Amino acid sequence: EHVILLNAQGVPTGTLEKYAAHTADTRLHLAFSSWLFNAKGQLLVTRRALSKKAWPGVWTNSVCGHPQLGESNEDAVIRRCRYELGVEITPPESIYPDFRYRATDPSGIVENEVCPVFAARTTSALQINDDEVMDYQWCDLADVLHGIDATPWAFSPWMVMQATNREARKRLSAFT
Ligand SMILES: [Mn+2]
Numbered sequence: 714e715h716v717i718l719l720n721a722q723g724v725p726t727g728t729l730e731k732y733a734a735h736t737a738d739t740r741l742h743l744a745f746s747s748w749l750f751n752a753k754g755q756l757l758v759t760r761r762a763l764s765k766k767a768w769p770g771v772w773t774n775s776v777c778g779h780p781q782l783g784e785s786n787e788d789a790v791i792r793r794c795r796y797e798l799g800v801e802i803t804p805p806e807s808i809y810p811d812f813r814y815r816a817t818d819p820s821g822i823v824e825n826e827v828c829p830v831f832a833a834r835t836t837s838a839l840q841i842n843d844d845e846v847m848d849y850q851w852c853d854l855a856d857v858l859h860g861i862d863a864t865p866w867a868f869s870p871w872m873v874m875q876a877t878n879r880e881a882r883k884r885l886s887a888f889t
Contacts, residue, residue, distance in 0.1 A: 759774075812827075
């Protein structure tokens with residue numbers, strides 16, 4: 714696994730090995746986030762495994778990751794959903810294509826990402842990958858947004874930042 718590097722124009726300049734790109738001085742790179750909803754309209758919230766290098770043991774939106782060379786964003790979502798959660802999904806839909814953030818985790822590991830956001834619905838049962846996900850929950854969207862708004866430090870910084878953008882929250886609500 715690698716990440717795709719980007720300049721200030723969102724133009725790709727190359728590539729680096731996933732683990733090694735993520736340091737105290739992480740260079741701008743490409744990621745994605747998806748918000749997954751079941752047939753009841755509940756959002757899947759997941760807790761990252763204790764073994765993750767960056768934000769281990771942290772609650773977060775359904776699935777995030779790094780698209781690889783030659784793979785669309787959508788296919789990255791679909792593949793990471795099969796890999797982390799053992800689940801099939803409807804075609805990912807853009808909700809926040811221009812999302813970009815920088816943040817620092819309790820060990821000083823920085824994420825610095827152009828991170829388009831998607832929503833999809835699950836169409837099969839979860840089969841949890843314990844190396845990635847230590848816990849999850851199905852929740853009402855409005856409950857999660859109140860949590861995020863009250864105690865943001867309880868969630869990952871990309872989850873919070875995505876959820877707090879007005880256009881993004883409105884599209885996520887409409888999707889449910
Ligand atoms: Mn990253």
